[PDB]
């Protein structure tokens, strides 16, 4: 394809309830969307950056700037483009994985629409729907946490993940176990909030049968996680540290991880995400699909990815209404604890123009 | 896509010159081809078995049988099929990777034709052509070997691989180095002909600067290779042992391998092959494309596979005329030491009906 | 000490000769300078970013944005600032190490000036001058390389470093050895241009007695370097991979590095740089001081840093005129192959206001 | 700074209550103090030796002799002097770390006073007060132990350390746990009193949830401690073995230690101590500040050191009145379980001349 241009938009979508993590509290989701335009048709991408660099070094204004001044111009200057060629065309730019992933996603959506092929088919889907868990934030009190968890369990979510941080770990876990029992699939996520010195506190999670503890230590501390896995019984899962398939392989060989959370944007796109999946499967490491509170666009791509064979644990791809009263696409609706994999060409969904215009704060054409 | 049926044919194609390996001499290539038929269109697969179980346990009649009685029926019984779903549909059947790979190849060719998409685009090609080496058989004498190698070097092949076995290793290598010099890319391939007890003989290859030695020990002896790598300077490459992406990861972690030969049929198909490629790349292990003397059909798929980013050494996908006077497809022709990656839908090539009929020995229809 | 504000300036300084590396060619140095203002006085910092993200993910506009919107406001909101506290005050922001380092540098310069204390004394200097090498770019031809190298050797530089890349490695090295002999201190630097599959080409450097090969593989590939070190005789040095003292310790323990290049901006500042020095010294790993074509400001801080006890190989801190016809501070002048360690308070140099104004392209006050 | 001379004094300070360890009972603290005199002003150091070589090979008369005949003359012969240059000026003398450390401390106090800079600022303090534990000696009976511990807990000490030895380990620990409960921070210290053959006895401490067991085996037996860590659940802490940052790195790599007690005199001074802190932090090893029953002078320097970022467990820097009815400086007073980090120049404290004269037993001038 020849890329004619890309429209970049900033969108703001209010959340149904505030979402608190060890790095802070979010009440509105601000994001960047991309519309890649080729002579044949268009494709949509979604950046998973947030407003500030609190989860990783990338953030919305930074992703916008790098897309406008470096990444989109490199793609416009090439003759033929394909999604696979996006990686070597952008390889001279270090990092900026989320931005590159978004751009790749838009290119891939346009390419696959031209071949009348779904994301699911391109990625190697083996099932038509996927079981979905839910990620539950840090709360002000224990009774408020139990109400929220009970609510998600009644809606049919198959697994519960709790955000944890120092001063909110063992108690919320103990309380969820006391109230809802030992058969609920339960896990925790620290988003880098601990150090190796906290190993005795994290070992106090041992009796509760957690599936995993996700990213207890900082992003760059892979050996620290391997040392941590020698001191605790709960399996380690990595999120932030898994920036590439090579990073996954390294972490696996060092003993730092037993389960991997795959987030396509974090690894530089859906094509790298499939490679992470395949590296993990080859080492016997189960994977599950992460969530960055995406719109229906990212959600649809994630649901497709999550239908791959080594996604053997429930992902964080919850229904649209877990986060948004009104999505910009046709919404994802939970049915028997599952979401259906989209069947149309490309992502299988597209923004509803009037809904997208209501939440658009800015736009620019790069061409 | 519903599979309506598959035609299986047996083909016999005379080779331009006999091809001798440590497991014997071949003057005719006998193979199984598969034509998958769907309501929308057809796709071709090619099985890389030989007549008897000399390279691996699988062989032509065996592959034919398992395809007819187990693998094709399991696909005919499914409602919608995709090339990815072939693996879980056939997982209850142990082994038979080359047979499964052929079937997957045919399904993939048909699927991708329906989307007007090339094998290269599906697999993640980043280049439009690939540099090609050649594999050179065991000869009766040294002067005959040097003639053949000189000939391939004049045709523009960028790398030479020599078949070796006890009684034909160090001397042919020394002679090729003496006659053509130290700048030729050179490697050797034993096809499992040594044991760990031969480590001193294989260490005598050390001074010749070989890129690699391919599969010195038996298929199942991964630890033996890692022990061998501690006793010799030439990098170990595995072929027969690499049956899967998991096998590649295991061998890598054990220190048994530094470069991997990928053959899609040997690993159960092009989709597993891409996974092998990706596993290897994630560990810093270069890969190159192996060759099983395929027709233009397999050759086309191989050339597309060889255009992926971690194929950083020249493969064995030589021109059609290295093996066959006349191929059953449009032939691959060497140009500046390279072959072009096919651009059409699916494989980008298809059999020429009159040429295919001339070499068909037997045919059978399975399904409706 | 409270921070009153920070002035940020963009500067453009023409190079005396273009400088080519595996990631491209530079003829003008564009940089960000910081003037921190406190009630105790002013201090100067220098960011080592370039215009685009080619050496690392950080670049001038991105560093500027993050300093203005996140980092400088976090320091302005603090009740007490001391250079040591800058790190925990900015720890909530992920990455942006060069930006953080620049800000820390300016804070430190102001703080040390108030105490009439030099950078050298603060960092733990044990000597009054340091031996200096020179970094030599990729050239169009071999005879041009040998002319440049001969010229640096006549000026009295004690060590030669050659930029290398595929197609310019073994030949330039062989030629320098053939022309100038085996007693010249010689090393190479790839800036991440090779892969592990290139181990045979890099092993062809073995006979030439190189001090080291610097950063042959990509930034995130630590295990790859440890494998590389088992296949080649030339000691491995890391630059880009060494992002922190913790990264250094990890790389050392994994066998990935024998010598460490310390660049203070790359690790998030002079205080982390001293920690990298001390971690390396504790493991018996020599260090040397890297260079990012800094003005006299950065150069002065680097020369002080390079006077620490475990800096036992010559650094890349060349004389000012190796890069700039006219520096913005008093220039560093080579004498007997050495540069003198500055003796005044803080950095021991400051910009000459008229020279700085001539090269300033933009200025903003953040208060 | 040229050193004009040093006054060395011997001091004897009665303890409020005798303090029994596995190596014997102390009722009076005998120590060496140093007053370094430069043309600008003076600085105080404190040697942590005891009267005889029971804790380590160094003792008061030996430290005094080496200071007088080797160490102080080497510094007086040097034209240019800084605290950082003390190490290479004394490096030709093997060992005598506590003596070297005391001399470095005095030099540093004078240097920093001339720059109007606190120990805290020089070392890299990130907080203004530190939480303080207490070390409790071996008693004749269990009820006497429980009385003493209950008394320290009522005063607000945040952690209890028990001295242990064969015949006084499991029982005192069990009793403290039965009386005061599982939430008290509790650890033990053997001062080298066990052998690897006592692993079964030390494993009987496993059920009591101790933070650590400090130096169970002899000083030089690093591999023995790593073996011991495989046989017991209580984390191993080293004191006597950690004689340098390099020693710490070695012990960490061998698996011999999980937490490190830092004592500045033991490692050859406050500047080495900061290196130990930084080496440990880079390996994920928490540190805590040890106590050698110093006067207010050492105590002030320790409190500053204990305010560094990786001091994440409570130290043994108890209030002055834990040991001494009357200190020679302004006393450290516990407030809410914390001591305040001094804010003046240098140590931030100096001896009260009349109090110092009351406890001085001998004085000499070296000049
Ligand atoms: C669903 C969820 O927990 N997402 C992120 C955290 C996150 C929080 C806020 C905004 C985006 C992502 C995680 O898995 O770490
Ligand atoms: C081209 C070549 O040497 N191919 C096989 C040998 C072979 C020939 C024919 C049939 C099967 C295998 C190998 O690499 O082992
Ligand atoms: C002096 C030198 O070689 N500097 C950098 C490269 C560099 C060039 C230009 C600007 C910044 C960095 C290095 O050591 O990687
Ligand atoms: C406070 C304490 O227990 N100090 C020493 C013991 C000691 C007692 C008397 C004099 C010096 C050291 C230790 O931690 O080993
Ligand atoms: Mg997470
Ligand atoms: Mg082979
Ligand atoms: Mg460099
Ligand atoms: Mg002790």
Short mmCIF file of C-alpha atoms in Angstrom, two decimals, chain B:
data_model
loop_
_atom_site.label_atom_id
_atom_site.label_comp_id
_atom_site.label_asym_id
_atom_site.label_seq_id
_atom_site.Cartn_x
_atom_site.Cartn_y
_atom_site.Cartn_z
CA UNK B 1 -13.74 -22.15 4.30
CA UNK B 2 -15.06 -25.81 4.22
CA UNK B 3 -12.67 -28.35 2.79
CA UNK B 4 -14.52 -30.37 0.03
CA UNK B 5 -11.71 -32.77 -0.61
CA UNK B 6 -8.14 -33.43 -1.43
CA UNK B 7 -6.50 -35.02 -4.39
CA UNK B 8 -3.27 -36.76 -3.56
CA UNK B 9 -0.75 -37.53 -6.29
CA UNK B 10 2.50 -39.33 -6.44
CA UNK B 11 5.11 -37.73 -8.68
CA UNK B 12 8.57 -38.96 -9.91
CA UNK B 13 10.99 -36.32 -11.20
CA UNK B 14 14.41 -37.30 -12.48
CA UNK B 15 17.30 -35.38 -11.05
CA UNK B 16 19.84 -33.64 -13.25
CA UNK B 17 22.66 -35.55 -11.40
CA UNK B 18 22.63 -38.14 -8.62
CA UNK B 19 22.63 -36.63 -5.10
CA UNK B 20 24.57 -38.57 -2.48
CA UNK B 21 24.24 -37.97 1.26
CA UNK B 22 25.45 -40.09 4.24
CA UNK B 23 22.15 -42.04 4.11
CA UNK B 24 22.42 -43.00 0.33
CA UNK B 25 22.17 -41.83 -3.28
CA UNK B 26 19.15 -40.44 -5.02
CA UNK B 27 18.82 -40.17 -8.84
CA UNK B 28 14.97 -39.58 -8.97
CA UNK B 29 12.88 -37.56 -6.51
CA UNK B 30 9.64 -39.30 -5.57
CA UNK B 31 7.13 -37.13 -3.83
CA UNK B 32 3.54 -36.64 -2.67
CA UNK B 33 1.53 -33.58 -3.74
CA UNK B 34 -1.76 -32.43 -2.37
CA UNK B 35 -4.47 -30.43 -4.11
CA UNK B 36 -6.93 -29.16 -1.56
CA UNK B 37 -10.35 -28.28 -3.03
CA UNK B 38 -12.71 -25.90 -1.36
CA UNK B 39 -16.03 -24.47 -2.82
CA UNK B 40 -14.14 -21.18 -3.64
CA UNK B 41 -10.91 -22.62 -5.19
CA UNK B 42 -7.90 -24.86 -4.81
CA UNK B 43 -4.50 -24.87 -3.01
CA UNK B 44 -1.36 -26.99 -3.40
CA UNK B 45 0.80 -28.64 -0.76
CA UNK B 46 3.97 -30.69 -1.10
CA UNK B 47 5.19 -33.40 1.27
CA UNK B 48 8.95 -33.60 1.81
CA UNK B 49 9.07 -37.32 2.56
CA UNK B 50 11.18 -39.64 0.46
CA UNK B 51 10.46 -43.21 -0.61
CA UNK B 52 11.87 -44.83 2.52
CA UNK B 53 12.50 -43.82 6.15
CA UNK B 54 16.20 -42.94 5.81
CA UNK B 55 16.25 -39.23 6.79
CA UNK B 56 13.41 -39.51 9.28
CA UNK B 57 10.74 -42.04 10.24
CA UNK B 58 8.23 -40.60 7.76
CA UNK B 59 8.14 -41.80 4.15
CA UNK B 60 5.88 -41.48 1.10
CA UNK B 61 3.54 -44.44 1.51
CA UNK B 62 3.36 -43.79 5.26
CA UNK B 63 2.47 -40.13 4.75
CA UNK B 64 -0.08 -41.08 2.11
CA UNK B 65 -1.73 -43.53 4.42
CA UNK B 66 -1.95 -41.25 7.45
CA UNK B 67 -3.24 -38.40 5.24
CA UNK B 68 -5.97 -40.59 3.74
CA UNK B 69 -7.16 -42.36 6.84
CA UNK B 70 -6.66 -39.83 9.65
CA UNK B 71 -5.58 -36.33 8.75
CA UNK B 72 -7.74 -35.47 5.72
CA UNK B 73 -10.85 -37.02 7.25
CA UNK B 74 -10.40 -34.93 10.42
CA UNK B 75 -10.32 -31.76 8.31
CA UNK B 76 -13.33 -32.91 6.18
CA UNK B 77 -15.35 -33.46 9.36
CA UNK B 78 -14.77 -29.86 10.61
CA UNK B 79 -17.24 -26.98 9.62
CA UNK B 80 -15.13 -23.78 8.94
CA UNK B 81 -11.30 -24.40 8.63
CA UNK B 82 -8.38 -22.00 8.57
CA UNK B 83 -4.71 -22.88 8.28
CA UNK B 84 -4.25 -22.01 11.97
CA UNK B 85 -7.01 -24.34 13.03
CA UNK B 86 -5.41 -27.24 11.21
CA UNK B 87 -2.98 -27.75 14.17
CA UNK B 88 -5.61 -28.25 16.95
CA UNK B 89 -7.80 -30.27 14.57
CA UNK B 90 -4.84 -32.70 14.02
CA UNK B 91 -3.29 -32.56 17.51
CA UNK B 92 -4.77 -35.89 18.63
CA UNK B 93 -2.50 -37.55 16.04
CA UNK B 94 1.03 -37.99 17.29
CA UNK B 95 3.92 -37.10 15.04
CA UNK B 96 3.54 -37.25 11.23
CA UNK B 97 4.83 -33.74 10.96
CA UNK B 98 5.78 -33.79 7.32
CA UNK B 99 2.32 -35.13 6.36
CA UNK B 100 0.60 -32.52 8.52
CA UNK B 101 2.82 -29.78 7.10
CA UNK B 102 1.88 -30.69 3.53
CA UNK B 103 -1.79 -30.56 4.37
CA UNK B 104 -1.44 -27.25 6.13
CA UNK B 105 0.50 -25.88 3.18
CA UNK B 106 -2.39 -26.76 0.80
CA UNK B 107 -4.99 -25.28 3.14
CA UNK B 108 -2.93 -22.14 3.50
CA UNK B 109 -2.47 -21.78 -0.25
CA UNK B 110 -6.24 -22.00 -0.76
CA UNK B 111 -7.03 -19.63 2.13
CA UNK B 112 -4.56 -17.03 1.09
CA UNK B 113 -5.70 -17.18 -2.60
CA UNK B 114 -9.19 -16.35 -1.38
CA UNK B 115 -7.80 -13.21 0.33
CA UNK B 116 -5.51 -12.36 -2.66
CA UNK B 117 -2.55 -12.54 -0.28
CA UNK B 118 0.92 -13.97 -0.89
CA UNK B 119 2.72 -16.54 1.33
CA UNK B 120 5.43 -13.89 1.70
CA UNK B 121 2.97 -11.28 3.07
CA UNK B 122 1.38 -13.79 5.42
CA UNK B 123 4.73 -14.97 6.82
CA UNK B 124 6.11 -11.40 7.32
CA UNK B 125 8.55 -10.95 4.37
CA UNK B 126 10.79 -7.84 4.56
CA UNK B 127 12.74 -8.40 1.26
CA UNK B 128 11.98 -9.08 -2.43
CA UNK B 129 14.72 -11.53 -3.07
CA UNK B 130 17.04 -13.89 -1.12
CA UNK B 131 20.65 -14.98 -1.51
CA UNK B 132 21.04 -18.64 -2.32
CA UNK B 133 23.63 -21.22 -1.60
CA UNK B 134 23.90 -24.76 -2.87
CA UNK B 135 24.21 -28.18 -1.28
CA UNK B 136 26.87 -30.44 -2.89
CA UNK B 137 26.76 -34.22 -2.51
CA UNK B 138 29.39 -36.76 -1.62
CA UNK B 139 31.50 -37.56 -4.76
CA UNK B 140 33.64 -40.60 -5.82
CA UNK B 141 36.81 -38.45 -6.05
CA UNK B 142 38.23 -35.10 -5.00
CA UNK B 143 38.78 -33.77 -8.55
CA UNK B 144 35.13 -34.46 -9.38
CA UNK B 145 34.10 -32.50 -6.19
CA UNK B 146 36.27 -29.48 -7.11
CA UNK B 147 34.81 -29.42 -10.65
CA UNK B 148 31.25 -29.41 -9.31
CA UNK B 149 31.99 -26.73 -6.70
CA UNK B 150 33.83 -24.54 -9.27
CA UNK B 151 30.79 -24.89 -11.55
CA UNK B 152 28.35 -23.72 -8.84
CA UNK B 153 30.62 -20.84 -7.90
CA UNK B 154 30.69 -19.71 -11.62
CA UNK B 155 26.82 -19.86 -11.73
CA UNK B 156 26.82 -17.28 -8.86
CA UNK B 157 25.77 -19.36 -5.80
CA UNK B 158 26.92 -17.37 -2.68
CA UNK B 159 27.69 -20.28 -0.43
CA UNK B 160 28.81 -23.87 -0.59
CA UNK B 161 27.60 -26.72 1.65
CA UNK B 162 29.31 -30.15 1.44
CA UNK B 163 27.66 -33.44 2.42
CA UNK B 164 30.02 -35.34 4.66
CA UNK B 165 30.34 -38.76 6.29
CA UNK B 166 33.21 -40.88 7.86
CA UNK B 167 35.86 -41.22 5.10
CA UNK B 168 34.76 -37.93 3.42
CA UNK B 169 35.11 -34.88 5.65
CA UNK B 170 38.48 -33.31 6.30
CA UNK B 171 39.95 -34.15 2.79
CA UNK B 172 37.12 -32.65 0.75
CA UNK B 173 37.06 -29.61 2.98
CA UNK B 174 40.90 -29.12 2.79
CA UNK B 175 40.76 -29.52 -0.98
CA UNK B 176 37.94 -26.94 -1.44
CA UNK B 177 39.87 -24.48 0.71
CA UNK B 178 43.21 -25.16 -1.16
CA UNK B 179 41.52 -24.66 -4.64
CA UNK B 180 39.01 -21.78 -3.97
CA UNK B 181 40.41 -19.96 -0.96
CA UNK B 182 39.41 -18.71 2.47
CA UNK B 183 36.73 -16.15 1.33
CA UNK B 184 34.19 -18.69 0.05
CA UNK B 185 31.32 -19.19 2.50
CA UNK B 186 31.65 -22.91 3.31
CA UNK B 187 29.82 -25.39 5.61
CA UNK B 188 29.28 -29.10 6.02
CA UNK B 189 26.35 -31.46 6.70
CA UNK B 190 26.61 -34.99 8.15
CA UNK B 191 22.93 -35.98 8.26
CA UNK B 192 23.50 -37.74 11.64
CA UNK B 193 26.52 -39.82 10.49
CA UNK B 194 28.84 -39.28 13.51
CA UNK B 195 28.88 -40.14 17.24
CA UNK B 196 30.40 -38.20 20.12
CA UNK B 197 33.37 -40.59 19.95
CA UNK B 198 34.21 -38.99 16.54
CA UNK B 199 34.78 -35.56 18.18
CA UNK B 200 38.56 -35.74 17.40
CA UNK B 201 37.91 -36.31 13.66
CA UNK B 202 35.36 -33.38 13.63
CA UNK B 203 37.83 -31.15 15.53
CA UNK B 204 40.18 -31.61 12.51
CA UNK B 205 37.70 -29.31 10.63
CA UNK B 206 38.60 -26.42 13.07
CA UNK B 207 41.39 -24.76 10.94
CA UNK B 208 39.15 -24.40 7.84
CA UNK B 209 36.84 -21.54 9.08
CA UNK B 210 33.55 -23.34 8.32
CA UNK B 211 30.31 -21.42 9.02
CA UNK B 212 28.92 -24.49 10.69
CA UNK B 213 28.61 -28.18 10.86
CA UNK B 214 25.02 -29.35 10.42
CA UNK B 215 23.59 -32.25 12.39
CA UNK B 216 26.74 -34.28 13.19
CA UNK B 217 24.88 -36.62 15.59
CA UNK B 218 21.58 -38.38 15.68
CA UNK B 219 18.22 -36.57 15.77
CA UNK B 220 17.39 -37.35 19.43
CA UNK B 221 20.92 -36.58 20.79
CA UNK B 222 20.61 -32.94 21.83
CA UNK B 223 22.91 -33.20 24.92
CA UNK B 224 25.44 -35.00 22.77
CA UNK B 225 25.56 -31.97 20.49
CA UNK B 226 26.04 -29.57 23.40
CA UNK B 227 28.93 -31.79 24.60
CA UNK B 228 30.27 -31.81 21.04
CA UNK B 229 30.18 -27.97 20.89
CA UNK B 230 32.54 -27.94 23.92
CA UNK B 231 35.10 -30.08 22.03
CA UNK B 232 35.07 -28.34 18.55
CA UNK B 233 35.41 -24.76 17.22
CA UNK B 234 33.01 -25.08 14.24
CA UNK B 235 29.47 -23.77 15.27
CA UNK B 236 26.83 -26.48 15.55
CA UNK B 237 23.73 -26.25 13.32
CA UNK B 238 20.82 -28.53 13.82
CA UNK B 239 18.38 -29.85 11.17
CA UNK B 240 16.86 -33.21 12.04
CA UNK B 241 16.66 -32.43 15.83
CA UNK B 242 14.64 -29.24 15.25
CA UNK B 243 11.18 -30.72 15.07
CA UNK B 244 9.30 -27.74 16.58
CA UNK B 245 9.68 -24.30 18.04
CA UNK B 246 9.79 -25.96 21.50
CA UNK B 247 12.58 -28.28 20.33
CA UNK B 248 14.49 -25.20 19.11
CA UNK B 249 14.06 -23.42 22.47
CA UNK B 250 15.17 -26.56 24.37
CA UNK B 251 18.25 -27.03 22.17
CA UNK B 252 19.15 -23.40 22.45
CA UNK B 253 18.89 -23.39 26.25
CA UNK B 254 21.02 -26.56 26.49
CA UNK B 255 23.89 -25.04 24.49
CA UNK B 256 23.37 -27.61 21.69
CA UNK B 257 23.01 -25.20 18.78
CA UNK B 258 24.24 -21.83 17.50
CA UNK B 259 22.47 -21.70 14.10
CA UNK B 260 19.24 -23.36 13.05
CA UNK B 261 18.28 -24.86 9.65
CA UNK B 262 14.53 -24.43 9.24
CA UNK B 263 12.65 -26.93 6.99
CA UNK B 264 8.92 -26.27 7.11
CA UNK B 265 7.89 -29.87 6.41
CA UNK B 266 10.22 -31.23 9.12
CA UNK B 267 8.56 -28.95 11.74
CA UNK B 268 4.97 -29.63 10.69
CA UNK B 269 4.40 -26.68 8.39
CA UNK B 270 5.05 -23.09 7.39
CA UNK B 271 3.19 -21.74 10.41
CA UNK B 272 5.40 -23.72 12.87
CA UNK B 273 8.35 -22.67 10.75
CA UNK B 274 7.62 -19.02 11.36
CA UNK B 275 7.40 -19.80 15.09
CA UNK B 276 10.82 -21.51 14.92
CA UNK B 277 12.13 -18.38 13.18
CA UNK B 278 10.69 -16.12 15.92
CA UNK B 279 11.91 -18.29 18.81
CA UNK B 280 15.41 -18.33 17.30
CA UNK B 281 15.44 -14.59 16.66
CA UNK B 282 14.44 -13.92 20.32
CA UNK B 283 17.48 -15.88 21.44
CA UNK B 284 19.96 -14.33 18.99
CA UNK B 285 20.19 -17.56 16.87
CA UNK B 286 20.44 -16.98 13.10
CA UNK B 287 18.36 -19.24 10.84
CA UNK B 288 18.59 -20.33 7.20
CA UNK B 289 16.14 -22.12 4.93
CA UNK B 290 16.69 -25.83 4.33
CA UNK B 291 15.74 -27.68 1.11
CA UNK B 292 14.34 -31.17 0.59
CA UNK B 293 14.65 -31.08 -3.27
CA UNK B 294 11.17 -29.74 -3.56
CA UNK B 295 9.29 -28.92 -6.78
CA UNK B 296 8.55 -25.32 -7.60
CA UNK B 297 5.59 -25.48 -5.21
CA UNK B 298 7.68 -26.11 -2.07
CA UNK B 299 10.45 -24.02 -3.54
CA UNK B 300 8.15 -21.02 -3.84
CA UNK B 301 6.94 -21.32 -0.25
CA UNK B 302 10.55 -21.73 0.94
CA UNK B 303 11.73 -18.63 -0.90
CA UNK B 304 8.93 -16.62 0.71
CA UNK B 305 9.84 -18.04 4.17
CA UNK B 306 13.54 -17.29 3.56
CA UNK B 307 12.68 -13.58 3.06
CA UNK B 308 11.86 -13.15 6.79
CA UNK B 309 14.16 -10.89 8.93
CA UNK B 310 16.16 -13.51 10.94
CA UNK B 311 17.20 -15.55 7.81
CA UNK B 312 20.60 -13.92 7.85
CA UNK B 313 22.58 -16.76 6.33
CA UNK B 314 22.13 -18.07 2.76
CA UNK B 315 19.80 -20.98 2.40
CA UNK B 316 19.79 -24.20 0.44
CA UNK B 317 16.92 -22.98 -1.84
CA UNK B 318 18.88 -23.34 -5.06
CA UNK B 319 17.45 -22.64 -8.55
CA UNK B 320 15.05 -25.21 -10.03
CA UNK B 321 17.74 -26.28 -12.55
CA UNK B 322 20.15 -27.34 -9.82
CA UNK B 323 17.91 -30.35 -9.43
CA UNK B 324 15.42 -30.60 -12.30
CA UNK B 325 15.77 -30.10 -16.12
CA UNK B 326 12.14 -29.05 -16.10
CA UNK B 327 10.16 -28.10 -12.99
CA UNK B 328 6.35 -28.58 -12.73
CA UNK B 329 5.85 -24.85 -12.20
CA UNK B 330 7.39 -21.86 -13.71
CA UNK B 331 11.06 -22.37 -12.75
CA UNK B 332 13.09 -20.47 -10.15
CA UNK B 333 16.07 -18.92 -11.91
CA UNK B 334 19.18 -17.62 -10.19
CA UNK B 335 19.93 -13.98 -10.83
CA UNK B 336 22.98 -12.32 -9.20
CA UNK B 337 23.10 -15.17 -6.67
CA UNK B 338 19.46 -14.47 -5.62
CA UNK B 339 15.98 -15.84 -6.19
CA UNK B 340 12.96 -13.53 -6.41
CA UNK B 341 10.22 -13.85 -3.86
CA UNK B 342 6.87 -14.71 -5.59
CA UNK B 343 4.32 -11.90 -5.68
CA UNK B 344 1.02 -13.55 -6.73
CA UNK B 345 -1.72 -14.77 -4.37
CA UNK B 346 -0.92 -17.85 -2.26
CA UNK B 347 2.23 -19.69 -3.29
CA UNK B 348 2.45 -17.44 -6.33
CA UNK B 349 3.00 -20.45 -8.59
CA UNK B 350 0.91 -23.45 -9.62
CA UNK B 351 1.60 -26.64 -11.52
CA UNK B 352 1.57 -26.50 -15.34
CA UNK B 353 -1.03 -29.29 -15.99
CA UNK B 354 0.79 -31.02 -18.94
CA UNK B 355 4.11 -31.03 -17.03
CA UNK B 356 2.49 -32.38 -13.88
CA UNK B 357 0.66 -35.08 -15.77
CA UNK B 358 3.96 -36.22 -17.44
CA UNK B 359 5.46 -36.94 -13.95
CA UNK B 360 2.38 -38.28 -12.14
CA UNK B 361 2.67 -41.95 -11.21
CA UNK B 362 -0.65 -42.27 -9.27
CA UNK B 363 -3.62 -40.16 -8.12
CA UNK B 364 -6.48 -40.60 -5.68
CA UNK B 365 -9.45 -38.45 -4.62
CA UNK B 366 -10.46 -38.15 -0.93
CA UNK B 367 -13.82 -36.46 -0.01
CA UNK B 368 -16.76 -35.30 -2.30
#
